[PDB]
Design an enzyme around this catalytic site. Structure first.
Site, PDB file in Angstrom:
ATOM      1  N   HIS A 163       0.823  -1.191   0.000  1.00  0.00           N
ATOM      2  CA  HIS A 163       0.000   0.000   0.000  1.00  0.00           C
ATOM      3  C   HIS A 163       0.864   1.250   0.000  1.00  0.00           C
ATOM      4  O   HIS A 163       2.093   1.187   0.208  1.00  0.00           O
ATOM      5  CB  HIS A 163      -0.911   0.050   1.243  1.00  0.00           C
ATOM      6  CG  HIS A 163      -1.801  -1.126   1.376  1.00  0.00           C
ATOM      7  ND1 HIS A 163      -2.943  -1.286   0.686  1.00  0.00           N
ATOM      8  CD2 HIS A 163      -1.728  -2.211   2.181  1.00  0.00           C
ATOM      9  CE1 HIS A 163      -3.526  -2.421   1.014  1.00  0.00           C
ATOM     10  NE2 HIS A 163      -2.800  -3.021   1.943  1.00  0.00           N
ATOM     11  N   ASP A 209      -1.528   8.727  -1.681  1.00  0.00           N
ATOM     12  CA  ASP A 209      -1.525   9.893  -2.544  1.00  0.00           C
ATOM     13  C   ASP A 209      -2.453  10.931  -1.927  1.00  0.00           C
ATOM     14  O   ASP A 209      -3.651  10.652  -1.769  1.00  0.00           O
ATOM     15  CB  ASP A 209      -2.081   9.528  -3.916  1.00  0.00           C
ATOM     16  CG  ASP A 209      -2.341  10.511  -5.002  1.00  0.00           C
ATOM     17  OD1 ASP A 209      -2.366  11.724  -4.712  1.00  0.00           O
ATOM     18  OD2 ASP A 209      -2.590  10.123  -6.193  1.00  0.00           O
ATOM     19  N   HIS A 235      -4.182  14.444  -2.647  1.00  0.00           N
ATOM     20  CA  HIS A 235      -4.475  15.439  -3.675  1.00  0.00           C
ATOM     21  C   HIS A 235      -4.117  16.862  -3.211  1.00  0.00           C
ATOM     22  O   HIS A 235      -4.021  17.780  -4.032  1.00  0.00           O
ATOM     23  CB  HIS A 235      -5.920  15.401  -4.125  1.00  0.00           C
ATOM     24  CG  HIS A 235      -6.284  14.191  -4.909  1.00  0.00           C
ATOM     25  ND1 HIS A 235      -7.529  14.077  -5.475  1.00  0.00           N
ATOM     26  CD2 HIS A 235      -5.625  13.057  -5.276  1.00  0.00           C
ATOM     27  CE1 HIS A 235      -7.622  12.945  -6.141  1.00  0.00           C
ATOM     28  NE2 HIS A 235      -6.488  12.267  -6.063  1.00  0.00           N
ATOM     29  N   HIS A 271      -5.893   8.884  -1.209  1.00  0.00           N
ATOM     30  CA  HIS A 271      -6.216   7.489  -1.475  1.00  0.00           C
ATOM     31  C   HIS A 271      -4.943   6.700  -1.693  1.00  0.00           C
ATOM     32  O   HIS A 271      -3.912   7.255  -2.073  1.00  0.00           O
ATOM     33  CB  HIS A 271      -7.144   7.340  -2.678  1.00  0.00           C
ATOM     34  CG  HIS A 271      -6.629   7.864  -3.979  1.00  0.00           C
ATOM     35  ND1 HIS A 271      -5.781   7.150  -4.787  1.00  0.00           N
ATOM     36  CD2 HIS A 271      -6.799   9.050  -4.591  1.00  0.00           C
ATOM     37  CE1 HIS A 271      -5.485   7.892  -5.861  1.00  0.00           C
ATOM     38  NE2 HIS A 271      -6.098   9.059  -5.774  1.00  0.00           N
ATOM     39  N   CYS A 272      -5.028   5.390  -1.500  1.00  0.00           N
ATOM     40  CA  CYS A 272      -3.942   4.480  -1.859  1.00  0.00           C
ATOM     41  C   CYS A 272      -3.840   4.432  -3.377  1.00  0.00           C
ATOM     42  O   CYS A 272      -4.848   4.597  -4.083  1.00  0.00           O
ATOM     43  CB  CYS A 272      -4.268   3.117  -1.316  1.00  0.00           C
ATOM     44  SG  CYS A 272      -2.977   1.886  -1.482  1.00  0.00           S
ATOM     45  N   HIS A 312      -7.456  -0.853  -5.228  1.00  0.00           N
ATOM     46  CA  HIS A 312      -7.327  -0.411  -3.823  1.00  0.00           C
ATOM     47  C   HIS A 312      -8.337   0.682  -3.502  1.00  0.00           C
ATOM     48  O   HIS A 312      -8.945   0.654  -2.452  1.00  0.00           O
ATOM     49  CB  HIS A 312      -5.917   0.049  -3.524  1.00  0.00           C
ATOM     50  CG  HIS A 312      -4.953  -1.088  -3.395  1.00  0.00           C
ATOM     51  ND1 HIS A 312      -4.239  -1.294  -2.302  1.00  0.00           N
ATOM     52  CD2 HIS A 312      -4.601  -2.067  -4.253  1.00  0.00           C
ATOM     53  CE1 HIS A 312      -3.466  -2.354  -2.427  1.00  0.00           C
ATOM     54  NE2 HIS A 312      -3.679  -2.855  -3.633  1.00  0.00           N
ATOM     55  N   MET A 346     -10.040   2.241   0.126  1.00  0.00           N
ATOM     56  CA  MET A 346      -8.801   2.847   0.630  1.00  0.00           C
ATOM     57  C   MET A 346      -8.676   4.298   0.188  1.00  0.00           C
ATOM     58  O   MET A 346      -7.835   4.676  -0.635  1.00  0.00           O
ATOM     59  CB  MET A 346      -7.583   2.017   0.212  1.00  0.00           C
ATOM     60  CG  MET A 346      -6.558   2.027   1.318  1.00  0.00           C
ATOM     61  SD  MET A 346      -5.403   0.608   1.164  1.00  0.00           S
ATOM     62  CE  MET A 346      -4.211   1.332   2.308  1.00  0.00           C
ATOM     63  N   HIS A 397     -27.447  15.986  -2.074  1.00  0.00           N
ATOM     64  CA  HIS A 397     -28.687  16.710  -1.872  1.00  0.00           C
ATOM     65  C   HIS A 397     -29.158  16.471  -0.450  1.00  0.00           C
ATOM     66  O   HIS A 397     -29.243  15.303  -0.029  1.00  0.00           O
ATOM     67  CB  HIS A 397     -29.743  16.179  -2.856  1.00  0.00           C
ATOM     68  CG  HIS A 397     -31.049  16.899  -2.712  1.00  0.00           C
ATOM     69  ND1 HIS A 397     -31.404  17.926  -3.521  1.00  0.00           N
ATOM     70  CD2 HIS A 397     -32.099  16.874  -1.865  1.00  0.00           C
ATOM     71  CE1 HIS A 397     -32.557  18.472  -3.242  1.00  0.00           C
ATOM     72  NE2 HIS A 397     -33.031  17.856  -2.202  1.00  0.00           N
ATOM     73  N   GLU A 427     -29.626  23.283  -4.680  1.00  0.00           N
ATOM     74  CA  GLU A 427     -30.469  22.133  -4.340  1.00  0.00           C
ATOM     75  C   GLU A 427     -29.633  20.854  -4.333  1.00  0.00           C
ATOM     76  O   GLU A 427     -29.703  20.029  -3.411  1.00  0.00           O
ATOM     77  CB  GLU A 427     -31.694  22.023  -5.273  1.00  0.00           C
ATOM     78  CG  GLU A 427     -31.447  21.737  -6.732  1.00  0.00           C
ATOM     79  CD  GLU A 427     -32.674  21.836  -7.634  1.00  0.00           C
ATOM     80  OE1 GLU A 427     -33.712  21.201  -7.346  1.00  0.00           O
ATOM     81  OE2 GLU A 427     -32.548  22.567  -8.641  1.00  0.00           O
ATOM     82  N   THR A 428     -28.816  20.701  -5.360  1.00  0.00           N
ATOM     83  CA  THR A 428     -27.970  19.577  -5.622  1.00  0.00           C
ATOM     84  C   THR A 428     -26.705  20.123  -6.276  1.00  0.00           C
ATOM     85  O   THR A 428     -26.716  21.169  -6.945  1.00  0.00           O
ATOM     86  CB  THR A 428     -28.712  18.657  -6.597  1.00  0.00           C
ATOM     87  OG1 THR A 428     -29.968  18.289  -6.055  1.00  0.00           O
ATOM     88  CG2 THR A 428     -27.930  17.398  -6.883  1.00  0.00           C
ATOM     89  N   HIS A 430     -28.305  12.268  -5.387  1.00  0.00           N
ATOM     90  CA  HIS A 430     -29.599  12.423  -6.051  1.00  0.00           C
ATOM     91  C   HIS A 430     -29.690  11.797  -7.444  1.00  0.00           C
ATOM     92  O   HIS A 430     -30.572  12.162  -8.232  1.00  0.00           O
ATOM     93  CB  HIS A 430     -30.090  13.881  -6.018  1.00  0.00           C
ATOM     94  CG  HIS A 430     -31.570  14.060  -5.978  1.00  0.00           C
ATOM     95  ND1 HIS A 430     -32.388  13.698  -7.035  1.00  0.00           N
ATOM     96  CD2 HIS A 430     -32.394  14.587  -5.051  1.00  0.00           C
ATOM     97  CE1 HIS A 430     -33.661  14.013  -6.714  1.00  0.00           C
ATOM     98  NE2 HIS A 430     -33.706  14.560  -5.509  1.00  0.00           N
TER      99      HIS A 430
HETATM  100  O1  LIG Z   1     -35.650  15.434  -2.799  1.00  0.00           O
HETATM  101  N1  LIG Z   1     -35.668  14.211  -2.593  1.00  0.00           N
HETATM  102  O2  LIG Z   1     -35.533  13.164  -3.228  1.00  0.00           O
HETATM  103  O1  LIG Z   2      -4.324  10.944  -7.533  1.00  0.00           O
HETATM  104  N1  LIG Z   2      -4.194   9.899  -8.187  1.00  0.00           N
HETATM  105  O2  LIG Z   2      -4.874   8.926  -8.519  1.00  0.00           O
HETATM  106 CU   LIG Z   3      -3.793   0.000  -0.720  1.00  0.00          CU
HETATM  107 CU   LIG Z   4     -35.343  15.241  -4.654  1.00  0.00          CU
HETATM  108 CU   LIG Z   5      -6.123  10.581  -7.077  1.00  0.00          CU
END
Ligand SMILES: O=N[O-]
Ligand SMILES: O=N[O-]
Ligand SMILES: [Cu+2]
Ligand SMILES: [Cu+2]
Ligand SMILES: [Cu+2]
Ligand SMILES: O=N[O-]
Ligand SMILES: [Cu+2]
Ligand SMILES: [Cu+2]
Ligand SMILES: [Cu+2]
Lengths: 333, 333, 333
Positions: free
Chosen positions: A89, A92, A94, A129-130, A139, A144, A249, A273-274, A300
Site C-alpha cells: 500500500h 496519494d 491530492h 487514497h492508496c 485499492h 482505501m 442533496h 439544491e444539488t 440524487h
Molecule cells: O428530494 N428528494 O428526493
Molecule cells: O491521484 N491519483 O490517482
Molecule cells: Cu492500498
Molecule cells: Cu429530490
Molecule cells: Cu487521485
C-alpha cells in the site's frame, strides 16, 4: 526555512463521520501537524443482505478519517502497514505537490512503515487514497480513500468576503464497490486477493457499481448513527468520492454555500439544491438548519441512493416554523 | 405575519414546454400563489417503436408543469389523487424547507387530496418530484417530476448586475426511463404495478436507461411541436433532470448566460457550449438568437440524444447573417 | 464589413498533443484565418492487445488538430473528403453560430470539398466534430472530433483581471470507443461500415465504453511520447470530450486556474484537484510546475484511467523541493 524550528502538534484522529477537533481560524503560526494511520485489511459487511467483502482501509474505517490542517502547515504522516496485512500500500494526497501526491515515496510492504511530510499550500478539501502502481482502482474501490481539509488561516468566507463559521462538521465518504457477479447475478466470493484480482478488474470494467454507500455500508448513517443537528445550527458537510461522480442533496434543505469542487479560494455557490462532486474530488456544503425533523442526505441519482445505498439521515431537534412550511389541509378524502 | 392578510392569486397551469403567464419583475408585494395539480396514472407511448409504459404524472404530462413564483411568495398547492388511480403519491419541492420538501406532509391515497403551503425563500429553478417512502426512484423514473421557478423580485441579472429579460421561456423536462428487458433484450410488459415492481427495481439497478426523452417521448419537441423563436429574440430554456445528469447543448448556438445548477443569486456562466445539470437539479440558459433555421437542442451525450431520445428542435425565423457564417464554396467535386 | 479587406493568414496544423504556433495577445487586428483539413478513414490499433478499429479522422489523427484563433477573427476552413474514403462527412463547430455549427453547410461525399467561414464571436476552447444527419454519434465515437481555441485578443486573465501567460500548451483529446462485443465478451470485427452499423448502434446504446483513450490509443501519451515540462514552467492543458463526461486530474499537481467548461469570459476556478468537463465540451487548465519527476494525467474515474486507457504522463525536469514534499523516513521494517 528550518522546519525543525516550527511547533509540532500531534493529532488524534476519530472515526468518520466525526472529525477531530481543530480551530477554524488559526490560533498559532504555521505548524508541523503530525498524523499516524495504520492500514487494516479486513472483512466488512456492506449491505442488509450480508454481503461481505475484503476491504482495504486506512485506520480501520471506510472512508479513512478526515485530517484537518491550515494552509501552509506541514502535514507529517506516519503510515504503518502491519505484518498482519498481505498487500503493498501507499498514499496519494491530492493536497500535496510532487511524487504522485506522495505515492512514489510511501510504498510500504506488510511489516513496514514510512513517514511523509508535505506542505499544504492550497486551501480546500481534498481526497487522499492508496495508489499502488498497476493496482490503483482496485485499492481505491476496496475502500482505501479518505479526505483532508486545508482551512484558510482566517477560516471560511462567503461570496462577499464575510466570515462563515460552522458549529458542527461531518465527513461523508461515498464509496462505489464493484462486487463481482456470476452470470446469474449473484455475488461470487474469493479465497485470496490474487484469486480475486481478475474478476475484480472485470467487475470494475463494467463501470456499474453494485453498491454505493456512505460511511462504509448501507444504512450506516441512519438509526442510532444518524447525523444530528439543532434548528439554527450551522453545519458543514464534507463529502468525498475518490473514483466516481456524485450529486449530494439534503432532502428538505439546501446547500446555502457550496464549494462543489472543494477549493476555498473560490467563492461558494449559493442556494444549491444539488451539486456535482466529480470523481476524484472532495466538496463541502454549509447549511443553517431552519426546521426540525428527519432529513435524508443523498446522492440524487435516486437509484444510487435508495436502491444501491447512497443515503443517510439527519435528525434535527427544535421548533417547527409554520410560516416556512405547513399542512393547510391534511390528507383526507 | 398573518398570511391571511396577503393577496391570493390563482395560477392556471399549462402543459410543457409552455409556461403559465407571469411577470419577471414582481408587480405586487408578496403573495400566496395558489396551484392545483391532479395526479394521473396513464399509459404513454414513449418511442417510435410503440413502446407503451405505465406513467405516473402530475397533471397528465411528463414532465409535470412549470410553476412560477417570486422569492418570498408562498406556494399553496392543492394536490389531488383521484380514485381512478391505484397508487399512493406525494410531492417534494426542492424549493421548500422542511418535511422532506413537503413529502412527509402530502401523502395521498387514491381518493384523497391535501393542501401544502411553503415559503419560497430562495430564488432559482428547482425540481419537484413524487417521493413515497420506499418507492422513490420508481415514481420519479415513471415520470412523476417537474420544476418550479422562483424568480428574484427584480427579475434576472447578468454577471455585472445588469438586467436580463427574456422574451420567451420554455421548460424542457428530461426523463430517464428504465423499461425492463428480458434476456434477449426485448421490453417485457406487466399486468399490475405490484407485478412490475421487482423487475422495475432490477431495471433501475442497471443504471442504464432504455430511453432518455424530452417532454415525455422520442420526438416530442420536433415537427409541429418544435420550439420556435425569431432572430433577435431572448429565450430562456429551463431544463430539469430529477434523477440523472444531463449536459444540454443548443446545436448552432450557445448558452449566453447559464445557471447550470439553477440558482439565481449566483452570477451566470457566460458563453457556454454545453453545461452540466446534475441529476436532481434544474438549470436555466438564456440565449439571444442570431441566425434563422433549424437548431437541435440536445443532451450532448450524442448517444443519449440521437439513439435514446434526448433531442428536440427549434425552428427560428428571420434573416441570415453571412458575416457570422457563410458557405464560401458549397460542396463540390 | 467587407471581409475581403481583412488580412488572411494560413495556418499549418500540427498533430496533437502539440499545437500550431500562435500569439496569445493578438499582434494584428482581426484576420481571416485559413485552415485546411483532409478527412481520413483508416484502421487504428487502439490498445495493447492489438484491437483494430475503423477510425474516422480529421487530418489523420484522433483527436483532430487544435485550431487557434482570436475573438472576432473569421475561421475559414477548407474541408476535403478524398475519393479514397467511403462515407459522407461534415463539420460542426461549437464556436460557431448558425447552420448546426456548420454541419448543414459542409456535407461532403467522397471526392468533394467545401469551404466554410464563420466569425469566432465568443472566446474559449470549443469542440468541433463531424455530425452527418442520422449518424452523428457513430462518427463522433469513431474519432471524428477535435477542438478550437478562440483566445481573447488580450490573452488570458486570472480571477482578478491580471494576465496569465502560458509557456507551453498541450491538447489532450479524450475518446470513448464502443467496440461491439459478442456474448462471450470478445470484440467482433466487420467487413464494411454498413455491415458494422447496427452492431455499432447496439454497442453505443449500452452507454459503456470499451476503451477511453487520450490521443487515440492506450499509452499514446507515455514513454517517448510523454508530455514534458520543466519546474517553473506555466503549462496550459486543453482537454476535450465530444460525447461523454470526464474529470481530469494531474497526479502530483493541481489545476491552478481552470475553466472547466472552457469559456474565458468567466473567471477560472482556482486550485482544483479534479474538474468536470461535460460531454460535448472543451476545458482548459493552467498549472505552474513546482516539482520534477513523473506525473500521471488522468480521468479520475480511475477505472476509466488505468483499466480503459484514460491516462498519460508528464516527465518534468528540474530541482526537487524538499520543503514542499520529502520522505522523512523511507519505507523500512
Ligand atoms: O428530494 N428528494 O428526493
Ligand atoms: O491521484 N491519483 O490517482
Ligand atoms: Cu492500498
Ligand atoms: Cu429530490
Ligand atoms: Cu487521485
Ligand atoms: O453540436 N452538435 O452535436
Ligand atoms: Cu407518485
Ligand atoms: Cu464523419
Ligand atoms: Cu456538438
Amino acid at each position: 526555512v528550518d522546519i525543525s524550528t516550527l511547533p509540532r502538534v500531534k493529532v488524534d484522529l476519530v472515526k468518520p463521520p466525526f472529525v477531530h477537533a481543530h480551530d477554524q481560524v488559526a490560533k498559532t503560526g504555521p505548524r508541523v501537524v503530525e498524523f499516524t494511520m495504520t492500514i487494516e485489511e479486513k472483512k466488512l459487511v456492506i449491505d442488509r443482505e450480508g454481503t461481505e467483502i475484503h476491504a482495504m482501509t486506512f485506520n480501520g474505517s471506510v472512508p479513512g478519517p478526515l485530517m484537518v490542517v491550515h494552509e501552509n502547515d506541514y502535514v507529517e504522516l506516519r503510515l504503518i502497514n502491519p505484518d498482519t496485512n498481505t498487500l503493498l500500500h501507499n498514499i496519494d494526497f491530492h493536497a500535496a505537490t510532487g511524487a504522485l501526491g506522495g505515492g512514489a515515496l510511501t510504498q510500504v510492504n506488510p511489516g513496514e512503515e514510512t513517514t511523509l511530510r508535505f506542505k499544504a499550500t492550497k486551501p480546500g478539501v481534498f481526497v487522499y487514497h492508496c495508489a499502488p502502481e498497476g493496482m490503483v482502482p482496485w485499492h481505491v474501490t476496496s475502500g482505501m480513500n479518505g479526505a483532508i481539509m486545508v482551512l484558510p488561516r482566517d477560516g471560511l468566507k462567503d461570496e462577499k468576503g464575510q466570515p462563515l463559521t460552522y458549529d458542527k462538521i461531518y465527513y461523508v465518504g461515498e464509496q462505489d464497490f464493484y462486487v463481482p457477479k456470476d452470470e446469474a447475478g449473484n455475488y461470487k466470493k474469493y479465497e485470496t486477493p490474487g484469486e480475486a484480482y481478475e474478476d475484480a478488474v472485470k467487475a470494475m470494467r463494467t463501470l456499474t457499481p453494485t453498491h454505493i454507500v456512505f460511511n462504509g455500508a448501507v444504512g450506516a448513517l441512519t438509526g442510532d448513527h444518524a447525523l444530528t443537528a439543532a434548528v439554527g445550527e450551522r453545519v458543514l458537510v464534507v463529502h468525498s468520492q475518490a473514483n466516481r461522480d456524485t450529486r449530494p442533496h439534503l432532502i428538505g434543505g439546501h446547500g446555502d454555500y457550496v464549494w462543489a469542487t472543494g477549493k476555498f479560494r473560490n467563492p461558494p455557490d449559493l442556494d444549491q439544491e444539488t451539486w456535482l462532486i466529480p470523481g476524484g474530488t472532495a466538496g463541502a456544503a454549509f447549511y443553517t438548519f431552519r426546521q426540525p425533523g428527519v432529513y435524508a442526505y443523498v446522492n440524487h441519482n435516486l437509484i444510487e441512493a435508495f436502491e444501491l445505498g447512497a443515503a443517510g439521515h439527519f435528525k434535527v431537534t427544535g421548533e417547527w416554523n409554520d410560516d416556512l412550511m405547513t399542512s393547510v389541509v391534511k390528507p383526507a378524502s
